[PDB]
DNA sequence: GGTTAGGGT
């Protein structure tokens, strides 16, 4: 079953719809920052004051970083783009060294977990709440 | 696995 991002808690498998705000690829992994415009007390508070940054929002604790390893990296890195919507299913969350929630997709997860990330066509009606909530923060 | 909310690869 799906959860709003405000409803996810560390160390539990979860599923959610989100919009991709930022991507970053590296030699090690592929990184997404995603939001559904709901607030979570463990997300990192993104600052509007950063001297140099291409982040335009949302600010505060409204987005979660996802680290994609191995097949998840190879699959998404030249596919998922900023502005896309995604559906992430049965993904795990952890707490990093500084105490912030993060979502991780580890390589070769058991088929039984049915863990996945897929792009959602932007015209899909399940994305309506995201688009509506976005209006509160622009 | 990686380090810390940038960079813009």
Swiss-Prot record:
Keywords: Chromosome, DNA-binding, Nucleus, Telomere. The keyword DNA repair does not apply. The keyword DNA-binding applies. Its main location: nucleus. GO terms for cellular component: chromosome, telomeric repeat region; cytosol; nuclear telomere cap complex; nucleus; shelterin complex; telomere cap complex. It is found in: Nucleus; Chromosome, Telomere. GO terms for biological process: regulation of telomere maintenance via telomerase; telomere capping; telomere maintenance. One of its GO terms (molecular function) is telomerase inhibitor activity. Self-associates. Interacts with ccq1, poz1 and tpz1. Single-stranded telomeric DNA-binding protein that is required to protect the 3'-end telomeric overhang. It binds the consensus sequence 5'-GGTTAC-3'. Regulates telomerase and telomere length. Belongs to the telombin family. This is Protection of telomeres protein 1. The chain holds residues 200 to 337 of 555 of the full protein.
């Amino acid at each position: 079953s799906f959860s709003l991002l405000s409803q996810i808690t560390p160390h539990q498998r979860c599923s959610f719809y989100a919009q991709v705000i930022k991507t970053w690829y590296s030699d090690k992994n592929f990184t997404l920052y995603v939001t559904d415009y709901t607030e979570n007390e463990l997300f990192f508070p993104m600052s509007p004051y950063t001297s140099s940054s291409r982040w335009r929002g949302p600010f505060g604790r409204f987005s979660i970083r996802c680290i994609l390893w191995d097949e998840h990296d190879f699959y998404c890195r030249n596919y998922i783009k900023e502005g896309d919507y995604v559906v992430m299913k049965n993904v795990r969350t952890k707490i990093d060294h500084l105490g912030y929630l993060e979502c991780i997709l580890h390589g070769d997860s058991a088929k039984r977990y049915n863990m996945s990330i897929e792009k959602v066509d932007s015209e899909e009606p399940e994305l309506n709440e995201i688009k509506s909530r976005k209006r509160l923060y622009v």
